């Protein structure tokens, strides 16, 4: 049941807010609207300039107590404590975790300010709507540049030259072409600048020879159309993954390659026919049936029944961190921006309170950095942690705090604070035994598991201890101890490079380990900038709760915002069979293929980009695989583009990744940047789910926001690997009769000769 | 403890996956209530596309309804999404059982021949008061006649006395067959399934193409391959029940027309096929042991994969 972007009516007409605003104290009565297809939510202030915000630039609504209240005397005069509160809306939006801008509204009328937080939120947080298609895209841009008009409702041309800033002068030759106003003077009339114009006028822009080429390679010599069965061929041979099943997956049946020509082909004589033009081609490929990945992998569709152990998980270090380790602030809204973002483990440095107030508080071991009561912090989990995502969070203390009195009250707090969410007790099914597995992410929907020592960390007492149960730390003596003991609600934690001993000398008892027991992983000491270990390391021996310091959106946390994203951003994901099941085993360092798991192989080629920069430069883009040490590779690297950043196309050899041992852990990442190393966007892809054929890749920034204009075409082939010499024994099953029908006729040709 | 494993091979629908099943009843854990209780969204979607099958083949071969009121019913069951199934209320049960019910429907499941239906589809749609029950259990042969496509590469250890028998069950589609040489290390024993019903009907990824021409051409194929010099070969021909049944109406001689025996004789038919099979391989020397069976059947397939065990543990 994933509906697509829906903007209720109360949205779309718009209600009445006072905008307010703590730093400047300014106070302006506005209209808030959100247009017919939710890209912005968008007002008019000052005098009559339009400002808009991007709802996919969303990060959090907040309203009632959790709206940020106007401590100003001065604004709270023109305001006014239960109903004033109640009507306040905060919308956090921003790039990242850390640089969140802060927008306050108050409605005028009664119990407005709940519906529009609640319905901005949906939108924000729709999975469509972030992997929408590439004509979607376009489409925001033009909804754009017709909400931010002049004070007299006009589309000023200077915008759209904005928006277009790389080549200004072909921008105006292709508003002139259209019959357009193009001086950077004057302004266009909303009437005259209808959607079918701005679509012309991006083909007059972009010269397309890339998809010329692509025609001409589907037998289209005679290139101005394309036939319903040369379509319905080229979606079914080229545009289809061919690992799929061709019952569970059905082709393209004649009728339904008809329905897609009705939807794209604009000409009437190409559509009446059943024909295709390259305007109709070109929109086929940026279209809603065309997109790089299926819905099934963007979608909660992973079995969430299995043991805990048995999931990759969303983990933050040190979470309150807005900067380094050593010096800066501690954060109470890091952990709503983490728990809101979808991880599922957040680190608490809790410390002993000074003798007036003894109120427990959070901070890095004793260093330079700023402090934030307990209290706050736990009211900000329980606000966000079951936001985005109903699956357990785990809350990992590094309890220091060597008082009785101090360590009931954390205790106390979390009880109170969490109520029924909070886990204090074992559950029925799953007793704390020998040989009993852990619970499963489905068993535990909507819960808080405290991660506390029982009985450097300091020791616990009886109200702490008892609020552990399923996630018990413990210092790990061994492999061999571990599997001695057969406890699955013990788990112990690695720093990064005891981790990496580990992995490097006992790789398969590690694996063999992580079925049935937790390892969290953090990173070391010397990481004062707050750098990340690749998490890939450590997933692939089994490794759940890979932490990381989600403030530094650096390559390591780009991947882990990308592959996290799937299974519906749920923070879990499930690993691949053969390192669950306690039946099987194999090498994480395996330079050959496994036998039971179905390798791949992939072939990526980089055709062309589009608005990639917003002036002239030259462009590359980095193709990296990542997964076990055989799958990855990660120096390929097109050459820089020609100075053009509007349409650049790549005359480029095919990227070849020919042996995926383990696809189902391999994730393939495309990154865009500008010549001198500026990053412009990226795309994570789990190669197990990623298409064959042309596809526009819409690229994301940093921190995994959809990107409205930069975007890529490439060529992909994701096939079921082969090896070379056994290469005529795989046609063969695929196509028996072909090779059985040859030898039956060489022996009837025979029959003669032999006699007898 | 000795292990030895084995593979289920087959082209699509042959039957390897309700082999598996009974290996599961028989000699593993076997479906209690509560496994049961998953397989009733299962059962209701099988429903809804079988019917939805028929539905298709009205127009597609021009077949009337014989009631008006069907149409109606027609209409609506074909714009059910099976995927979001999870019930069999009102008013999908009174439609699809009156469809069921129209000499039109029936006289389109006759000549399924001419189309994909799944062939658990009569015993389901005879049994929808049953299926319907707001209480309903699934029986075991429920189970054993779902229809669920296998996709991959599945390997189920099981546990009897003398061994540990790993069953590896495959996907019998022409692009499942690309990743079989993914489970071709250290191969005990190959099992092979041919469906026996399947000797005039055509491929789902091939419609043009006889399904018990790939299934031969198959067989006589994988036999002769590497990795198989020192594995033994059993062959079952499966679904004898249901050629039983065919054989009294579609002609096997209007197939394969070296059949030279009499028509309406399901041991003569199914005997030719046998032959088809094993007879005059030229790459291949190795005894095939074959065995007629029906894999929806518990007792038949208790006994004959008892004969098969002995086969394989005496060559191993
Ligand atoms: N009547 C009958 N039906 C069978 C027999 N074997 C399998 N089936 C049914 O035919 C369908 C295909 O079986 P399945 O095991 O999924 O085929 P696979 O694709 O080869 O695994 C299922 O609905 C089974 O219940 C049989 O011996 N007799
Ligand atoms: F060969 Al199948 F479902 F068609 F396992
Ligand atoms: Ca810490
Ligand atoms: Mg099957």
Redesign the pocket.
């Known amino acids: 049941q994933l509906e697509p972007p829906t903007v209720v009516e109360t949205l779309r007409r718009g209600s009445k807010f006072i905008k307010w605003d703590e730093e400047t104290s300014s106070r302006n009565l506005v209209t808030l609207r959100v247009d017919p297809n939710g890209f912005f939510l968008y007002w008019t202030g000052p005098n009559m300039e339009v400002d808009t915000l991007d709802i996919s630039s969303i990060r959090d609504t907040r309203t009632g107590r959790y709206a940020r209240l106007p401590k100003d005397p001065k604004i709270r005069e023109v305001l006014g404590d239960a109903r004033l509160e109640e009507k306040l809306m905060t919308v956090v939006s921003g790039p990242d975790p850390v640089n969140t801008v802060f927008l306050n509204f108050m409605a005028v009328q009664d119990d407005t300010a709940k519906v529009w937080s609640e319905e901005l939120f949906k939108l924000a947080m729709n999975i469509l709507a972030q992997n929408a298609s590439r004509n979607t895209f376009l489409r925001k841009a033009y909804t754009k540049l017709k909400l931010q008009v002049n004070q007299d409702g006009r589309i000023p041309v200077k915008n759209i030259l904005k928006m277009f800033s790389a080549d200004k002068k072909r921008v105006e030759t292709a508003l002139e072409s259209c019959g357009l106003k193009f001086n950077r003077s004057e302004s266009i009339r909303p009437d005259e600048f209808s959607l079918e114009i701005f679509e012309r006028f991006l083909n007059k822009l972009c010269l397309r020879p890339d998809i010329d080429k692509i025609l001409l390679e589907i037998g289209a010599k005679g290139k101005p159309y394309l036939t319903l069965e040369q379509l319905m061929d080229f979606i079914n041979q080229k545009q289809r993954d061919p690992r799929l099943n061709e019952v569970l997956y059905p082709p393209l049946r004649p009728s339904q390659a008809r329905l897609l020509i009705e939807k794209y082909e604009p000409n009437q004589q190409f559509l009446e026919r059943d024909q295709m033009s390259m305007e109709g081609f070109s929109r086929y490929l940026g279209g809603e049936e065309n997109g790089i990945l299926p819905l099934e992998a963007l979608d909660l569709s992973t079995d969430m029944t299995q043991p805990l152990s048995a999931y990759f998980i969303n983990s933050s270090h040190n979470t309150y961190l807005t900067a380094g380790q050593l010096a800066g602030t501690s954060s109470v809204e890091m952990y709503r921006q983490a728990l809101l973002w979808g991880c599922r483990c957040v680190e608490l440095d809790v410390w002993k309170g000074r003798p007036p107030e003894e109120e427990p508080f959070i901070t890095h071991g004793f260093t330079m950095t700023t402090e934030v009561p307990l209290r706050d912090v736990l009211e900000a989990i329980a606000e966000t942690a079951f936001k985005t995502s109903p699956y357990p969070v785990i809350l990992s203390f590094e309890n220091h705090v060597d008082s009785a009195k101090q360590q009931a009250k954390m205790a106390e707090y979390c009880r109170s604070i969490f109520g029924d969410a909070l886990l204090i007790e074992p559950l029925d099914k799953y007793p704390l035994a020998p040989g009993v597995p852990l619970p499963s992410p489905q068993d535990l929907m909507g819960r808080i598991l405290v991660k506390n020592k029982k009985r450097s960390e300091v020791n616990a007492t009886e109200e702490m201890s008892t609020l552990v149960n399923y996630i018990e730390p413990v210092k790990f003596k061994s492999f061999e101890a571990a599997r001695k003991r057969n406890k699955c609600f013990e788990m112990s934690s690695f720093v990064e490079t005891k981790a990496m001993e580990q992995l490097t000398k006992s790789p398969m008892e590690f694996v063999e380990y992580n079925k049935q027991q937790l390892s969290r992983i953090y990173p070391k000491g010397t990481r004062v900038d707050s750098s990340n270990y690749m998490p890939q390391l450590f997933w692939n021996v089994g490794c759940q709760l890979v932490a990381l310091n989600f403030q530094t959106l650096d390559v390591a946390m780009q991947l882990n915002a990308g592959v996290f994203e799937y299974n519906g951003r749920s923070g879990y994901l499930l690993k691949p069979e053969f390192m669950r099941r306690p039946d099987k085993s194999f090498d994480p360092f395996t330079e050959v293929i496994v036998d039971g798991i179905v390798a791949n192989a992939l072939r990526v080629k980089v055709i062309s980009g589009q608005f990639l920069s917003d002036r002239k430069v030259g462009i590359y883009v980095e193709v990296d695989m990542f997964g076990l040490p055989v799958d990855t590779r990660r120096k390929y690297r097109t050459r820089t583009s020609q100075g053009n950043s509007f349409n650049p196309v790549w005359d480029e050899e095919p990227f070849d990744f020919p042996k995926v041992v383990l696809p189902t852990l391999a994730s393939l990442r495309i990154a865009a940047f500008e010549e001198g190393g500026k990053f412009v966007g990226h795309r994570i892809l789990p190669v197990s789910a990623i298409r064959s054929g042309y596809h526009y890749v819409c690229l994301r920034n940093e921190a995994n926001q959809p990107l409205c204009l930069p975007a890529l075409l490439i060529y992909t082939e994701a096939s079921d690997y082969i090896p070379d010499d056994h290469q005529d024994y795989a046609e063969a099953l695929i196509n028996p009769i072909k090779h059985v029908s040859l030898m039956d006729q060489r022996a009837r040709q025979l029959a003669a000769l032999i006699g007898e | 403890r000795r292990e030895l494993k084995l593979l289920?091979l087959?082209?699509?629908?042959?039957?390897?996956?309700?082999?598996?099943?009974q290996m599961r009843i028989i000699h593993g854990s076997g479906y209690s209530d509560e496994d049961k209780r998953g397989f009733t969204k299962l059962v209701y979607q099988?429903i809804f596309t079988a019917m939805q099958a028929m539905i298709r083949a009205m127009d597609t071969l021009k077949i009337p309804y014989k009631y008006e009121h069907n149409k109606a019913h027609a209409q609506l069951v074909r714009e059910v999404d099976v995927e979001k199934v999870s019930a069999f209320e009102n008013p999908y049960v009174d439609a699809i059982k009156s469809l069921w019910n129209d000499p039109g429907i029936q006289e389109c499941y006759d000549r399924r021949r001419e189309y994909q239906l799944?062939?658990?589809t009569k015993?389901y749609l005879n049994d929808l008061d049953r299926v319907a029950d707001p209480s309903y259990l699934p029986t075991q042969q429920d189970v054993?006649?779902?229809?669920?496509?296998?996709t991959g590469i599945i390997e189920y250890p099981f546990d009897l006395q003398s061994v540990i028998f790993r069953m590896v069950?495959v996907?019998?589609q022409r692009s499942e067959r690309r990743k079989w040489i993914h489970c071709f290390e250290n191969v005990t024993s190959i099992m092979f399934?041919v469906?026996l019903?399947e000797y005039d009907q055509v491929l789902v990824e091939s419609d043009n193409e006889n399904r018990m021409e790939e299934s031969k051409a198959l067989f006589r194929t994988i036999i002769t391959y590497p990795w198989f010099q020192n594995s033994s070969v059993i062959l079952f021909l499966?679904?004898?029940?249901?050629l039983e049944e065919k054989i009294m109406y579609s002609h096997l001689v209007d197939y394969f027309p070296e059949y030279d025996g009499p028509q309406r004789d399901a041991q003569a038919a199914r005997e030719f096929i046998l032959k088809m099979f094993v007879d005059l391989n030229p790459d291949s020397d190795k005894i095939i042991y074959s065995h007629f069976?029906?894999?929806?059947?518990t007792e038949n397939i208790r006994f004959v994969f008892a004969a098969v065990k002995d086969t394989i543990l005496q060559l191993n």
């Open positions: 289920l087959g082209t699509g629908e042959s039957g390897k996956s309700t082999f598996i099943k099988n799944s062939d658990s015993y054993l006649r779902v229809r669920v496509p296998t069950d996907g019998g399934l469906a019903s499966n679904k004898k029940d249901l069976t029906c894999a929806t059947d």
